Nucleic acid binder design. Structure first.
Ligand SMILES: [Mg+2]
Ligand SMILES: [Mg+2]
Ligand SMILES: [Mg+2]
Ligand SMILES: [Mg+2]
Ligand SMILES: [Mg+2]
Ligand SMILES: [Mg+2]
Ligand SMILES: [Mg+2]
Ligand SMILES: [Mg+2]
Ligand SMILES: [Mg+2]
Ligand SMILES: [Mg+2]
Ligand SMILES: [Mg+2]
Ligand SMILES: [Mg+2]
Ligand SMILES: [Mg+2]
Ligand SMILES: [Mg+2]
Ligand SMILES: [Mg+2]
Ligand SMILES: [Mg+2]
Ligand SMILES: [Mg+2]
Ligand SMILES: [Mg+2]
Ligand SMILES: [Mg+2]
Ligand SMILES: [Mg+2]
Ligand SMILES: [Mg+2]
Ligand SMILES: [Mg+2]
Ligand SMILES: [Mg+2]
Ligand SMILES: [Mg+2]
Ligand SMILES: [Mg+2]
Ligand SMILES: [Mg+2]
Ligand SMILES: [Mg+2]
Ligand SMILES: [Mg+2]
Ligand SMILES: [Mg+2]
Ligand SMILES: [Mg+2]
Ligand SMILES: [Mg+2]
Ligand SMILES: [Mg+2]
Ligand SMILES: [Mg+2]
Ligand SMILES: [Mg+2]
Ligand SMILES: [Mg+2]
Ligand SMILES: [Mg+2]
Ligand SMILES: [Mg+2]
Ligand SMILES: [Mg+2]
Ligand SMILES: [Mg+2]
Ligand SMILES: [Mg+2]
Ligand SMILES: [Mg+2]
Ligand SMILES: [Mg+2]
Ligand SMILES: [Mg+2]
Ligand SMILES: [Mg+2]
Ligand SMILES: [Mg+2]
Ligand SMILES: [Mg+2]
Ligand SMILES: [Mg+2]
Ligand SMILES: [Mg+2]
Ligand SMILES: [Mg+2]
Ligand SMILES: [Mg+2]
Ligand SMILES: [Mg+2]
Ligand SMILES: [Mg+2]
Ligand SMILES: [Mg+2]
Ligand SMILES: [Mg+2]
Ligand SMILES: [Mg+2]
Ligand SMILES: [Mg+2]
Ligand SMILES: [Mg+2]
Ligand SMILES: [Mg+2]
Ligand SMILES: [Mg+2]
Ligand SMILES: [Mg+2]
Ligand SMILES: [Mg+2]
Ligand SMILES: [Mg+2]
Ligand SMILES: [Mg+2]
Ligand SMILES: [Mg+2]
Ligand SMILES: [Mg+2]
Ligand SMILES: [Mg+2]
Ligand SMILES: [Mg+2]
Ligand SMILES: [Mg+2]
Ligand SMILES: [Mg+2]
Ligand SMILES: [Mg+2]
Ligand SMILES: [Mg+2]
Ligand SMILES: [Mg+2]
Ligand SMILES: [Mg+2]
Ligand SMILES: [Mg+2]
Ligand SMILES: [Mg+2]
Ligand SMILES: [Mg+2]
Ligand SMILES: [Mg+2]
Ligand SMILES: [Mg+2]
Ligand SMILES: [Mg+2]
Ligand SMILES: [Mg+2]
Ligand SMILES: [Mg+2]
Ligand SMILES: [Mg+2]
Ligand SMILES: [Mg+2]
Ligand SMILES: [Mg+2]
Ligand SMILES: [Mg+2]
Ligand SMILES: [Mg+2]
Ligand SMILES: [Mg+2]
Ligand SMILES: [Mg+2]
Ligand SMILES: [Mg+2]
Ligand SMILES: [Mg+2]
Ligand SMILES: [Mg+2]
Ligand SMILES: [Mg+2]
Ligand SMILES: [Mg+2]
Ligand SMILES: [Mg+2]
Ligand SMILES: [Mg+2]
Ligand SMILES: [Mg+2]
Ligand SMILES: [Mg+2]
Ligand SMILES: [Mg+2]
Ligand SMILES: [Mg+2]
Ligand SMILES: [Mg+2]
Ligand SMILES: [Mg+2]
Ligand SMILES: [Mg+2]
Ligand SMILES: [Mg+2]
Ligand SMILES: [Mg+2]
Ligand SMILES: [Mg+2]
Ligand SMILES: [Mg+2]
Ligand SMILES: [Mg+2]
Ligand SMILES: [Mg+2]
Ligand SMILES: [Mg+2]
Ligand SMILES: [Mg+2]
Ligand SMILES: [Mg+2]
Ligand SMILES: [Mg+2]
Ligand SMILES: [Mg+2]
Ligand SMILES: [Mg+2]
Ligand SMILES: [Mg+2]
Ligand SMILES: [Mg+2]
Ligand SMILES: [Mg+2]
Ligand SMILES: [Mg+2]
Ligand SMILES: [Mg+2]
Ligand SMILES: [Mg+2]
Ligand SMILES: [Mg+2]
Ligand SMILES: [Mg+2]
Ligand SMILES: [Mg+2]
Ligand SMILES: [Mg+2]
Ligand SMILES: [Mg+2]
Ligand SMILES: [Mg+2]
Ligand SMILES: [Mg+2]
Ligand SMILES: [Mg+2]
Ligand SMILES: [Mg+2]
Ligand SMILES: [Mg+2]
Ligand SMILES: [Mg+2]
Ligand SMILES: [Mg+2]
Ligand SMILES: [Mg+2]
Ligand SMILES: [Mg+2]
Ligand SMILES: [Mg+2]
Ligand SMILES: [Mg+2]
Ligand SMILES: [Mg+2]
Ligand SMILES: [Mg+2]
Ligand SMILES: [Mg+2]
Ligand SMILES: [Mg+2]
Ligand SMILES: [Mg+2]
Ligand SMILES: [Mg+2]
Ligand SMILES: [Mg+2]
Ligand SMILES: [Mg+2]
Ligand SMILES: [Mg+2]
Ligand SMILES: [Mg+2]
Ligand SMILES: [Mg+2]
Ligand SMILES: [Mg+2]
Ligand SMILES: [Mg+2]
Ligand SMILES: [Mg+2]
Ligand SMILES: [Mg+2]
Ligand SMILES: [Mg+2]
Ligand SMILES: [Mg+2]
Ligand SMILES: [Mg+2]
Ligand SMILES: [Mg+2]
Ligand SMILES: [Mg+2]
Ligand SMILES: [Mg+2]
Ligand SMILES: [Mg+2]
Ligand SMILES: [Mg+2]
Ligand SMILES: [Mg+2]
Ligand SMILES: [Mg+2]
Ligand SMILES: [Mg+2]
Ligand SMILES: [Mg+2]
Ligand SMILES: [Mg+2]
Ligand SMILES: [Mg+2]
Ligand SMILES: [Mg+2]
Ligand SMILES: [Mg+2]
Ligand SMILES: [Mg+2]
Ligand SMILES: [Mg+2]
Ligand SMILES: [Mg+2]
Ligand SMILES: [Mg+2]
Ligand SMILES: [Mg+2]
Ligand SMILES: [Mg+2]
Ligand SMILES: [Mg+2]
Ligand SMILES: [Mg+2]
Ligand SMILES: [Mg+2]
Ligand SMILES: [Mg+2]
Ligand SMILES: [Mg+2]
Ligand SMILES: [Mg+2]
Ligand SMILES: [Mg+2]
Ligand SMILES: [Mg+2]
Ligand SMILES: [Mg+2]
Ligand SMILES: [Mg+2]
Ligand SMILES: [Mg+2]
Ligand SMILES: [Mg+2]
Ligand SMILES: [Mg+2]
Ligand SMILES: [Mg+2]
Ligand SMILES: [Mg+2]
Ligand SMILES: [Mg+2]
Ligand SMILES: [Mg+2]
Ligand SMILES: [Mg+2]
Ligand SMILES: [Mg+2]
Ligand SMILES: [Mg+2]
Ligand SMILES: [Mg+2]
Ligand SMILES: [Mg+2]
Ligand SMILES: [Mg+2]
Ligand SMILES: [Mg+2]
Ligand SMILES: [Mg+2]
Ligand SMILES: [Mg+2]
Ligand SMILES: [Mg+2]
Ligand SMILES: [Mg+2]
Ligand SMILES: [Mg+2]
Ligand SMILES: [Mg+2]
Ligand SMILES: [Mg+2]
Ligand SMILES: [Mg+2]
Ligand SMILES: [Mg+2]
Ligand SMILES: [Mg+2]
Ligand SMILES: [Mg+2]
Ligand SMILES: [Mg+2]
Ligand SMILES: [Mg+2]
Ligand SMILES: [Mg+2]
Ligand SMILES: [Mg+2]
Ligand SMILES: [Mg+2]
Ligand SMILES: [Mg+2]
Ligand SMILES: [Mg+2]
Ligand SMILES: [Mg+2]
Ligand SMILES: [Mg+2]
Ligand SMILES: [Mg+2]
Ligand SMILES: [Mg+2]
Ligand SMILES: [Mg+2]
Ligand SMILES: [Mg+2]
Ligand SMILES: [Mg+2]
Ligand SMILES: [Mg+2]
Ligand SMILES: [Mg+2]
Ligand SMILES: [Mg+2]
Ligand SMILES: [Mg+2]
Ligand SMILES: [Mg+2]
Ligand SMILES: [Mg+2]
Ligand SMILES: [Mg+2]
Ligand SMILES: [Mg+2]
Ligand SMILES: [Mg+2]
Ligand SMILES: [Mg+2]
Ligand SMILES: [Mg+2]
Ligand SMILES: [Mg+2]
Ligand SMILES: [Mg+2]
Ligand SMILES: [Mg+2]
Ligand SMILES: [Mg+2]
Ligand SMILES: [Mg+2]
Ligand SMILES: [Mg+2]
Ligand SMILES: [Mg+2]
Ligand SMILES: [Mg+2]
Ligand SMILES: [Mg+2]
Ligand SMILES: [Mg+2]
Ligand SMILES: [Mg+2]
Ligand SMILES: [Mg+2]
Ligand SMILES: [Mg+2]
Ligand SMILES: [Mg+2]
Ligand SMILES: [Mg+2]
Ligand SMILES: [Mg+2]
Ligand SMILES: [Mg+2]
Ligand SMILES: [Mg+2]
Ligand SMILES: [Mg+2]
Ligand SMILES: [Mg+2]
Ligand SMILES: [Mg+2]
Ligand SMILES: [Mg+2]
Ligand SMILES: [Mg+2]
Ligand SMILES: [Mg+2]
Ligand SMILES: [Mg+2]
Ligand SMILES: [Mg+2]
Ligand SMILES: [Mg+2]
Ligand SMILES: [Mg+2]
Ligand SMILES: [Mg+2]
Ligand SMILES: [Mg+2]
Ligand SMILES: [Mg+2]
Ligand SMILES: [Mg+2]
Ligand SMILES: [Mg+2]
Ligand SMILES: [Mg+2]
Ligand SMILES: [Mg+2]
Ligand SMILES: [Mg+2]
Ligand SMILES: [Mg+2]
Ligand SMILES: [Zn+2]
Lengths: 204, 122, 118, 12, 131, 59
RNA sequence: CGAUGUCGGCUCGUCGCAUCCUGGGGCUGAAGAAGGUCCCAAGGGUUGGGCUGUUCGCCCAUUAAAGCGGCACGCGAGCUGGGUUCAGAACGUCGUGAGACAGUUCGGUCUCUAUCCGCCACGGGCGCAGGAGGCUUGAGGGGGGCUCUUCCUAGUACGAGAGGACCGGAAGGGACGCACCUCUGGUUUCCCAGCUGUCCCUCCAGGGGCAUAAGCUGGGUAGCCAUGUGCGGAAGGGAUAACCGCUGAAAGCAUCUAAGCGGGAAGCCCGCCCCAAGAUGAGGCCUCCCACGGCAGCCGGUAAGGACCCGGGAAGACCACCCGGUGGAUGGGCCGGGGGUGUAAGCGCCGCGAGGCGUUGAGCCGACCGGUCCCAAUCGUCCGAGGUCU
RNA sequence: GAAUGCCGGCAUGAGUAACGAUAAAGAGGGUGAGAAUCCCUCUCGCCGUAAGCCCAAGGGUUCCUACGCAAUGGUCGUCAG
RNA sequence: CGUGAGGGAAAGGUGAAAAGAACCCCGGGAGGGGAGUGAAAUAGAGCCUGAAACCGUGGGCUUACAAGCAGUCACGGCCCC
């Protein structure tokens, strides 16, 4: 496995072989390793990556300590990549060359309290022919006396989005290392400015 | 974006003027037909003594749609109507002329005879 | 949702909101300082700031523009001749909002003052 | 399937 | 960080600087590279531009023409690499930015509604006088 | 609808357990650096009229 | 019977398996392809329409298929109300009659507020023997699980011919799912413009209100979106079902079995995605504070940190989450860019005039990308360890 | 101790539904122990074959002025039928 | 309450005596705190007695890994005599 932290910057398309290819631009580098998890010590293998520089005037004492033991300027975000152990003490976009497929994780956009139609694509009610104040309602939620209750997991209105999402097997279309940019084909979860994780894909 | 109930102009000299799609022949359950797709249609309107007559159930390939179609080069194309050419079960025209331009997508989908017969291919 | 939308609704329809702002502007430019609810105040700033900035242009076009909201020729004269000159060298920020300490008795509304800047 | 109703509808 | 400038930096390698300016109402001939198996060629599409939707590198323009009795609209990206060149054939004078309305007009009615843009025509002929 | 209705009276226990969240939070107050009177932060002092060092208001 | 609302539809599922399809098999009167018949298999799938109130059924066009049942003939404190139980009216029929009819016909009041359990979301509390800021393991859960066409192998094997494979390989789809907004396409309640009537400011010119909760019309950014775009189903390992074997007695032969060992499903376990230590079985790692004053307890002040308050936020019903608070770019102004509109007002010129031309892509200008301390996040307060016993 | 008993008192639902046309408000100045709600001014909106004006029914002091705010007013009240 | 015939309530108690609380204090008032009266003022006029449901303040014991017609039997802990 290999991975990097990054922020989603925005979308475009580029032209390649007389084709328009939709891309999301990701600012991925550069990510200092600030701790390594080892099987002797932690029971598993991973690298704690840091990302984005922080005003030391905002970093408290327990955090300051942590950074210091690794000799790293204070960073805004700390996040692990599992089963990844890079030779260097800094991970940059260069771990990816164009043509590789990656998995991207982000925090999906938040729709707050979502009705049953937006959330679960329910059909809702009719809009004429007698429908009585039930146009976006979910219908029946059960049976009768048997079982006389509602299943765990019943699709229902409630909060939707602002949740971890990973979309898989996105083509790396380009990488522009002098600017820490990754171009991934297609769509990535979450808003512009959102923190994302780019890992080497698990599909074959 | 053609679907059952959709009326199409017929762009040939089969005698049919207007057909009404009753199925899009593309899988178990396709919702829409676009340029290059075969549909099954009822001949809703024809002219006296053609190959085809009002009432006939025929096959046709869509050659023009009013919904614009997108292309891998980033472009699109859109026509003033939805038109089709009536074919046989071997996908050949049953007419001998086809009228108006047609979508280049037809060539790539093996409706070669129709493409050639067309005055313009866009 | 409301994602990246600018502008309070203030529980008024479209034409009422516009009038709300215009009337507050008239009042503010008239007295130099008014008291309102905090949300109304915060929202007044830009509305009036733009009007002042225009008076700093001084030209006819700007006068006729400002007249669309303020509607009162004397008021706009005061705006162009007495008010705007104070801000010749000020780059925006011609108004301030400061919150009062007491809530209205009858509805508990939190209050603020809005004033033109020195 | 179609069986006779055993209750009437309503009232006040 | 400036997310906007980053995107512009990505886009910059594909940006075109060599096409003539045109407006809605102008009559244009777009020479477009087209694949027909197994060869590619230039096919000319010529019509009134009824729309130009701006978004930097992503702006696109829509062209309308009547072909063999049927109306055809084509949507091109202003920076597409498959555009060999664009020729201004005529300058028309719109009074609005989107000309969807011409879709319901007779060829005669259109001609009355999109008079020749004498100003910019003269300007065109005014350049075209090169050292 | 068919007019829902409480099935059983709520117990003194249960009614009061609902109210385990009903206690008021006392007002947050800071001294005004001028007159040392207690007032809510980020408001102009209602006693002497000062905010951010200056007199702003006739009290 | 001091009421358990009754057909059908809609919505939402969930289960069974006597399996409609897809997967694996045995026999075939199985040449091939395609069928029959039984066995294993419930993971997923199982279309749109005409007729009828219909369930059902027939029919049209497709499909891999167009499964059958249970859940109060699932579901009216979810909807419908076509059928059927009221009162009106008519037909046929029966009755001298009033009236009646598993005969028909047209019409005919379906109840804003959820206490408890259950369900979907979100917090508050306390606990996790010192108090804290982070980063995590994953017990255990949940999600997903579909399939077709074409091409190569190969017109090969098989067949007189028609027809036409196994295995293996490549491409393109339909339906569904998650995310997204570059493109396509919507919306965009005031972003711009045009227009009518009327009243008004100020007579002209230029404007404002009202005509909807936008007067109307043409456009329309960001956002939220699908008709648009990316991506998913796997791969793979393991154990099995039916079924096929290897070796092999009892039983000198034979036997898949009694010892042992193989192969073998879309199914089962892992693998993928998401939740998760209230996992009270309360886990782990990194870092920080520290050994305070007064009689496993009480009180007092602090530490590391936290909260309150404030500016905000593609976060959000409140709460929470996240960012920022002058050692600052958090919002508001302002400036530059984008973007929309599509050439403002004023003036000059031409025309008797409506107008037109130039100044001019002008003027106006939400949210988008940035800059800039001009305005406001002033000033502060409160809580918060001293670590129980083997 | 029960009669869906009778009369009364007090609970629960609950700080919940609601506060009675979506014609609509904002500010400044007064008054007062106290003001979103009372008086005044300016700005805004609504009716105008009416939501203006005058008769007749019916009502019966509700009219005007002074002094008041316990209750009545769906909130407040210094105002008021 | 009902057009009407007609129907038809609820509502008793300071103290022996008003001696019914001057005066001061907080409050706009209501209300209270002192002073005073009385044998007695939780007899203060919302007045004899003043039960119960119901609401609240203070204290003892107890409760945030637990399964219920709420009790009962046993034992242990704590608090009181
Ligand atoms: Mg590991
Ligand atoms: Mg491991
Ligand atoms: Mg490893
Ligand atoms: Mg909604
Ligand atoms: Mg929705
Ligand atoms: Mg959804
Ligand atoms: Mg949908
Ligand atoms: Mg539907
Ligand atoms: Mg719908
Ligand atoms: Mg529906
Ligand atoms: Mg109804
Ligand atoms: Mg409705
Ligand atoms: Mg049950
Ligand atoms: Mg759940
Ligand atoms: Mg749900
Ligand atoms: Mg959330
Ligand atoms: Mg992951
Ligand atoms: Mg792929
Ligand atoms: Mg792929
Ligand atoms: Mg490239
Ligand atoms: Mg993250
Ligand atoms: Mg034709
Ligand atoms: Mg006919
Ligand atoms: Mg036929
Ligand atoms: Mg909304
Ligand atoms: Mg915003
Ligand atoms: Mg807003
Ligand atoms: Mg606004
Ligand atoms: Mg707001
Ligand atoms: Mg409202
Ligand atoms: Mg509202
Ligand atoms: Mg309002
Ligand atoms: Mg308006
Ligand atoms: Mg209006
Ligand atoms: Mg506005
Ligand atoms: Mg004054
Ligand atoms: Mg602005
Ligand atoms: Mg305030
Ligand atoms: Mg306050
Ligand atoms: Mg207050
Ligand atoms: Mg009030
Ligand atoms: Mg951008
Ligand atoms: Mg840059
Ligand atoms: Mg550009
Ligand atoms: Mg123009
Ligand atoms: Mg003519
Ligand atoms: Mg010229
Ligand atoms: Mg209803
Ligand atoms: Mg209750
Ligand atoms: Mg009870
Ligand atoms: Mg009870
Ligand atoms: Mg309760
Ligand atoms: Mg209690
Ligand atoms: Mg409760
Ligand atoms: Mg101060
Ligand atoms: Mg019964
Ligand atoms: Mg009942
Ligand atoms: Mg009942
Ligand atoms: Mg139906
Ligand atoms: Mg329905
Ligand atoms: Mg329906
Ligand atoms: Mg079930
Ligand atoms: Mg099912
Ligand atoms: Mg079973
Ligand atoms: Mg089972
Ligand atoms: Mg079976
Ligand atoms: Mg069977
Ligand atoms: Mg069978
Ligand atoms: Mg099968
Ligand atoms: Mg099979
Ligand atoms: Mg088989
Ligand atoms: Mg055979
Ligand atoms: Mg066979
Ligand atoms: Mg055979
Ligand atoms: Mg058999
Ligand atoms: Mg078989
Ligand atoms: Mg059978
Ligand atoms: Mg199954
Ligand atoms: Mg099933
Ligand atoms: Mg159907
Ligand atoms: Mg059907
Ligand atoms: Mg019909
Ligand atoms: Mg039907
Ligand atoms: Mg029908
Ligand atoms: Mg039927
Ligand atoms: Mg039938
Ligand atoms: Mg088959
Ligand atoms: Mg069917
Ligand atoms: Mg079924
Ligand atoms: Mg079922
Ligand atoms: Mg049954
Ligand atoms: Mg049924
Ligand atoms: Mg039923
Ligand atoms: Mg039922
Ligand atoms: Mg009902
Ligand atoms: Mg029903
Ligand atoms: Mg029910
Ligand atoms: Mg029920
Ligand atoms: Mg419902
Ligand atoms: Mg009916
Ligand atoms: Mg009927
Ligand atoms: Mg029935
Ligand atoms: Mg009957
Ligand atoms: Mg009748
Ligand atoms: Mg008889
Ligand atoms: Mg008779
Ligand atoms: Mg007889
Ligand atoms: Mg009888
Ligand atoms: Mg009868
Ligand atoms: Mg019957
Ligand atoms: Mg009967
Ligand atoms: Mg019969
Ligand atoms: Mg009938
Ligand atoms: Mg009937
Ligand atoms: Mg009727
Ligand atoms: Mg109902
Ligand atoms: Mg009822
Ligand atoms: Mg209702
Ligand atoms: Mg409610
Ligand atoms: Mg409840
Ligand atoms: Mg219960
Ligand atoms: Mg919690
Ligand atoms: Mg600890
Ligand atoms: Mg922690
Ligand atoms: Mg592990
Ligand atoms: Mg597990
Ligand atoms: Mg558990
Ligand atoms: Mg599952
Ligand atoms: Mg599942
Ligand atoms: Mg596939
Ligand atoms: Mg071959
Ligand atoms: Mg052959
Ligand atoms: Mg052959
Ligand atoms: Mg060949
Ligand atoms: Mg071979
Ligand atoms: Mg042979
Ligand atoms: Mg052959
Ligand atoms: Mg194959
Ligand atoms: Mg596929
Ligand atoms: Mg966009
Ligand atoms: Mg768009
Ligand atoms: Mg668009
Ligand atoms: Mg549009
Ligand atoms: Mg504006
Ligand atoms: Mg006007
Ligand atoms: Mg005029
Ligand atoms: Mg005018
Ligand atoms: Mg306006
Ligand atoms: Mg007016
Ligand atoms: Mg208007
Ligand atoms: Mg009006
Ligand atoms: Mg109106
Ligand atoms: Mg509009
Ligand atoms: Mg307007
Ligand atoms: Mg658009
Ligand atoms: Mg937009
Ligand atoms: Mg926006
Ligand atoms: Mg779609
Ligand atoms: Mg796919
Ligand atoms: Mg496998
Ligand atoms: Mg294996
Ligand atoms: Mg195996
Ligand atoms: Mg053997
Ligand atoms: Mg042997
Ligand atoms: Mg042997
Ligand atoms: Mg064995
Ligand atoms: Mg044995
Ligand atoms: Mg085995
Ligand atoms: Mg599969
Ligand atoms: Mg996690
Ligand atoms: Mg824990
Ligand atoms: Mg955890
Ligand atoms: Mg357990
Ligand atoms: Mg423990
Ligand atoms: Mg822990
Ligand atoms: Mg561990
Ligand atoms: Mg760490
Ligand atoms: Mg110390
Ligand atoms: Mg020490
Ligand atoms: Mg100590
Ligand atoms: Mg000591
Ligand atoms: Mg501190
Ligand atoms: Mg949000
Ligand atoms: Mg907020
Ligand atoms: Mg809060
Ligand atoms: Mg903070
Ligand atoms: Mg501070
Ligand atoms: Mg400052
Ligand atoms: Mg800022
Ligand atoms: Mg700014
Ligand atoms: Mg700007
Ligand atoms: Mg522009
Ligand atoms: Mg001009
Ligand atoms: Mg001009
Ligand atoms: Mg003249
Ligand atoms: Mg003249
Ligand atoms: Mg020029
Ligand atoms: Mg400008
Ligand atoms: Mg601009
Ligand atoms: Mg830019
Ligand atoms: Mg900005
Ligand atoms: Mg400043
Ligand atoms: Mg600076
Ligand atoms: Mg302390
Ligand atoms: Mg020891
Ligand atoms: Mg008894
Ligand atoms: Mg009762
Ligand atoms: Mg009762
Ligand atoms: Mg009784
Ligand atoms: Mg009783
Ligand atoms: Mg009672
Ligand atoms: Mg109560
Ligand atoms: Mg509440
Ligand atoms: Mg409730
Ligand atoms: Mg509520
Ligand atoms: Mg009400
Ligand atoms: Mg409410
Ligand atoms: Mg009212
Ligand atoms: Mg109201
Ligand atoms: Mg209202
Ligand atoms: Mg209002
Ligand atoms: Mg207001
Ligand atoms: Mg005042
Ligand atoms: Mg006085
Ligand atoms: Mg005074
Ligand atoms: Mg008031
Ligand atoms: Mg008051
Ligand atoms: Mg006032
Ligand atoms: Mg009012
Ligand atoms: Mg004024
Ligand atoms: Mg009039
Ligand atoms: Mg009228
Ligand atoms: Mg009289
Ligand atoms: Mg009266
Ligand atoms: Mg009176
Ligand atoms: Mg007098
Ligand atoms: Mg009163
Ligand atoms: Mg009062
Ligand atoms: Mg009062
Ligand atoms: Mg009273
Ligand atoms: Mg009085
Ligand atoms: Mg009141
Ligand atoms: Mg009332
Ligand atoms: Mg007073
Ligand atoms: Mg008075
Ligand atoms: Mg009066
Ligand atoms: Mg009466
Ligand atoms: Mg009377
Ligand atoms: Mg008494
Ligand atoms: Mg006496
Ligand atoms: Mg006094
Ligand atoms: Mg008073
Ligand atoms: Mg007193
Ligand atoms: Mg007293
Ligand atoms: Mg005595
Ligand atoms: Mg005494
Ligand atoms: Mg006393
Ligand atoms: Mg006593
Ligand atoms: Mg006594
Ligand atoms: Mg006595
Ligand atoms: Mg007593
Ligand atoms: Mg008493
Ligand atoms: Mg008592
Ligand atoms: Mg209490
Ligand atoms: Mg107690
Ligand atoms: Mg346990
Ligand atoms: Mg315990
Ligand atoms: Mg328990
Ligand atoms: Mg029990
Ligand atoms: Mg017990
Ligand atoms: Zn002060």
């Amino acid at each position: 496995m290999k991975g990097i932290l990054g922020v989603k910057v925005g979308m475009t398309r580029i032209f390649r072989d007389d084709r328009a290819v939709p891309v999301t631009v990701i600012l991925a580098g550069p990510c200092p390793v600030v701790q390594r998890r080892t099987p002797e010590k932690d029971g598993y293998t991973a690298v704690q990556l840091g990302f984005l520089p922080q005003n030391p005037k905002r970093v408290n004492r327990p955090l300051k300590g942590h950074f210091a033991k690794a000799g790293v300027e204070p960073v805004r975000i700390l996040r692990e990549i599992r089963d990844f152990n890079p030779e260097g003490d800094t991970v940059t976009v260069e771990i990816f060359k164009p043509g590789e497929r990656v998995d991207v994780t982000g925090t999906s956009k938040g729709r707050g309290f979502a009705g049953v139609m937006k959330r679960w694509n329910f059909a809702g009610g009719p809009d004429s022919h007698g429908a009585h104040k039930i146009h976006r309602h979910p219908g029946s939620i059960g049976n009768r006396k048997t079982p006389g209750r509602v299943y765990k997991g019943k699709k229902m209105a409630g909060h939707y989005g602002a949740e971890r999402v990973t979309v898989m097997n996105l083509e790396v279309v380009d990488v522009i290392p002098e600017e820490n940019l990754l171009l991934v084909k297609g769509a990535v979860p979450g808003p512009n400015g959102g923190l994302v994780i780019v890992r080497e894909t698990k599909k074959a | 974006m053609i679907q059952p109930q959709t009326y199409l102009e017929v762009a040939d000299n089969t005698g049919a003027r207007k057909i009404m799609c009753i199925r899009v022949l593309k899988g178990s359950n396709a919702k829409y037909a676009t340029v290059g797709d075969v549909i099954v249609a009822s001949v809703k309107e024809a002219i006296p003594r053609g190959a085809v007559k009002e009432g006939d159930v025929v096959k046709a390939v869509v050659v023009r749609t009013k919904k614009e179609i997108k292309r891998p080069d980033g472009s699109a194309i859109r026509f003033d109507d939805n038109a089709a050419v009536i074919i046989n079960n071997q996908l050949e025209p049953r007419g001998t002329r086809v009228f108006g331009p047609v979508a280049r997508e037809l060539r790539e989908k093996g409706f070669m005879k129709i493409v050639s017969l067309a005055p313009e291919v866009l | 949702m409301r994602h990246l939308k600018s502008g309070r609704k203030l529980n008024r329809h479209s034409s009422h909101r516009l009038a709300l702002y215009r009337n507050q502007a008239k009042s503010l430019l008239t007295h130099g300082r008014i008291t309102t609810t905090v949300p109304k105040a915060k929202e007044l700033r830009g509305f009036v700031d733009h009007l002042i900035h225009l008076a700093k242009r001084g030209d006819l076009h700007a006068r006729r523009l400002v007249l669309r909201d303020l509607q009162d020729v004397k008021l706009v004269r005061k705006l162009f001749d007495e008010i705007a000159p104070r801000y010749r060298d000020r780059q925006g920020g011609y108004t301030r909002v400061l919150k009062l300490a007491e809530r209205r008795r009858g509805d508990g509304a939190p209050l603020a003052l809005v004033e033109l800047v020195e | 399937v179609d069986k006779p109703p055993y209750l009437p509808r309503p009232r006040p | 960080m400036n997310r906007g400038a980053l995107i512009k930096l990505v886009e910059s390698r594909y940006v075109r600087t060599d096409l003539p300016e045109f407006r809605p109402g102008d009559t244009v001939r777009v020479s477009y590279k087209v694949k027909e198996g197994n060869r590619t060629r230039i096919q000319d599409f010529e019509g009134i531009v009824i729309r130009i939707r701006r978004n930097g590198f992503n702006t696109t323009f829509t062209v309308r023409k009547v072909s063999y009795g049927v109306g055809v609209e084509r949507i091109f990206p202003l920076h597409s690499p498959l555009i060999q060149k664009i020729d201004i054939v005529q300058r028309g004078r719109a009074r609005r930015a989107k000309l969807y309305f011409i879709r319901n007009l007779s060829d005669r009615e259109i001609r009355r509604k999109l008079r020749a843009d004498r100003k910019r025509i003269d300007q065109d002929r005014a350049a075209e006088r090169a050292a | 609808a068919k007019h829902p209705v409480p099935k059983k009276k709520t117990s003194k226990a249960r009614r009061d357990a609902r109210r385990s969240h009903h206690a008021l939070t006392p007002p947050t107050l800071v001294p005004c650096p001028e007159c040392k009177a207690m007032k809510p932060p980020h408001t102009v002092c209602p006693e002497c009229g000062y905010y951010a060092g200056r007199k702003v208001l006739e009290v």
